[PDB]
């Protein structure tokens, strides 16, 4: 099955910049969410989970069809808490009803990363909503209680290599685990709504202890009040991941560049862009626009 990108009729960069801006302005406005973390992190997670169902072997799942809007996928236990992101986007979709659901979910992640001072993420339009029977079954998103070998094998299904995996996981600078959603509790760092390379710094520099949380799951905790999932900590247990963690801990620009490429790729997996499709858009931040 081939999914061909189809530009929303008559739309161009300026239309999508308006959608970006609306998302960005609402991120600014609804600042109190999650003890003043704001909605940036959950929007990044929503873009990832809506994209991360993809299977390279048969082109099922992925961002194209926007299938999170259907109950099988929004009720996936792996997606617990993302309803907050969807609720955020509802008034955006109401105002801009012409954008596809996949375009909105993916654009929400791009907008969040950029507004949180992250790298620019080129973004392409043209995802098309697909019907309810195209919704992927639950169980394609990764488990957190696993090791490096699991992580590496998992991400092969998304056509990601070691460098891409380690770069993508740097998104765990953002937000936190919430016990009621995932069975894990705590933030990965201190700057919970600013996109930086802090995840890698904390992995290497904190003193981590393997503890059980209140849901009876193991997680790595530091005296600073940070946590790492077992899959996060596996990036410093595996010698190939560890070298890349050290690289990104020591080179903010490199992390930004590599993240941007991997995150665009994640959001585009499964989609065929025609030769004459528009080039990727690079949206201006609110700050860049003086807004």
Interface residue list for ligand HEM (CB under 6 A): 41-42, 44-45, 48, 81, 142, 144, 151, 168-169, 171-172, 174-178, 181-182, 184, 229, 231, 263
Looking at residue 280, the DSSP 8-state letter turns out to be: P
Q: Which is nearer to ligand HEM, 135 or 234 (CB)?
A: 234
> Is there a catalytic annotation at residue 3?
no
Any residues with CB less than 8 A from the CB of 60 and at least 6 apart, and which?
A: 1, 53, 54, 134, 136
Q: Which is nearer to ligand HEM, 81 or 278 (CB)?
A: 81
> Is there a catalytic annotation at residue 57?
no
120, 158, 250 from 273: Cα distances, Å: 20, 18, 35
For the bound state, the minimum distance from the C-beta of residue 139 to ligand HEM, rounded and expressed in Å, comes to 13
- Rounded Cα distance between 209 and 179, Å, is 18
For the bound state, the minimum distance from the C-beta of residue 21 to ligand HEM, rounded and expressed in Å, comes to 22
Q: Which is nearer to ligand HEM, 227 or 249 (CB)?
A: 227
Q: Which is nearer to ligand HEM, 140 or 176 (CB)?
A: 176
Q: Put residue 65 in one of left, alpha, beta given phi > 0 → left and psi -120 to 50 → alpha.
A: alpha
14, 31, 245, 283 from 112: Cα distances, Å: 18, 13, 23, 12
Catalytic residue among 3, 48, 49, 208: 49
- Rounded Cα distance between 233 and 226, Å, is 12
Which residue, judged by CB position, is nearest to ligand HEM in the bound state? Answer: 175
Number of other CB atoms surrounding residue 8 within 10 Å = 17
For the bound state, the minimum distance from the C-beta of residue 81 to ligand HEM, rounded and expressed in Å, comes to 4
Summary count for the chain: helices (H), strands (E)? 14, 7
* Strand (E) or helix (H) holding 72: helix 71-74
Catalytic residue among 48, 54, 123, 188: 188
- Radius of gyration, CA atoms only, the chain: 18
- Rounded Cα distance between 247 and 147, Å, is 21
Which backbone phi and psi does 123 adopt, to 5 degrees?
-140, 140
Q: Is 178 part of any known ligand binding site?
A: no
Q: Which is nearer to ligand HEM, 130 or 192 (CB)?
A: 192
- Rounded Cα distance between 261 and 19, Å, is 22
Instruction: Extract the annotated binding site.
Output: 172
Catalytic machinery residues: 49, 188
Please report, in range form, the residues annotated as the binding site for heme b: 172
């Amino acid at each position: 099955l081939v999914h061909v990108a189809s530009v929303e009729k008559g739309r161009s960069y300026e239309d999508f910049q308006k959608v970006y801006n609306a998302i960005a302005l609402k991120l600014r406005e609804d600042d109190e969410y999650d003890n003043y973390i704001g909605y940036g992190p959950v929007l990044v997670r929503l873009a990832w989970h809506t994209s991360g169902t993809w299977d390279k072997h048969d082109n099922t799942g992925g961002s194209y069809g926007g299938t999170y809007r259907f109950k099988k996928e929004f009720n996936d236990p792996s997606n617990a808490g993302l309803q907050n992101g969807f609720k955020f986007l509802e008034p955006i979709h109401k105002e801009f009803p012409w954008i596809s659901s996949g375009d909105l979910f993916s654009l929400g992640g791009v907008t969040a990363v950029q507004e949180m001072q992250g790298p620019k993420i080129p973004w392409r339009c043209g995802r098309v909503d697909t019907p309810e029977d195209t919704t992927p079954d639950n169980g394609r998103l990764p488990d957190a209680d696993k090791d490096a070998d699991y992580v590496r094998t998992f991400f092969q299904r998304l056509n990601m290599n070691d460098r891409e995996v380690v770069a993508l996981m740097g998104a765990h600078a953002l937000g936190k685990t919430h016990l009621k959603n995932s069975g894990y509790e705590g933030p990965w760092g201190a700057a919970n709504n600013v996109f930086t390379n802090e995840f890698y710094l904390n992995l290497l520099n904190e003193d981590w202890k393997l503890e059980k949380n209140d849901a009876n799951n193991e997680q790595w905790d530091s005296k600073s009040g940070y946590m790492m999932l077992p899959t996060d900590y596996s990036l410093i247990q595996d010698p190939k991941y560890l070298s890349i963690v050290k690289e990104y801990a020591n080179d903010q620009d490199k992390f930004f560049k590599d993240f941007s490429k991997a995150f665009e790729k994640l959001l585009e997996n499964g989609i065929t862009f025609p030769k004459d499709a528009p080039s990727p858009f690079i949206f201006k931040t609110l700050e860049e626009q003086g807004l």
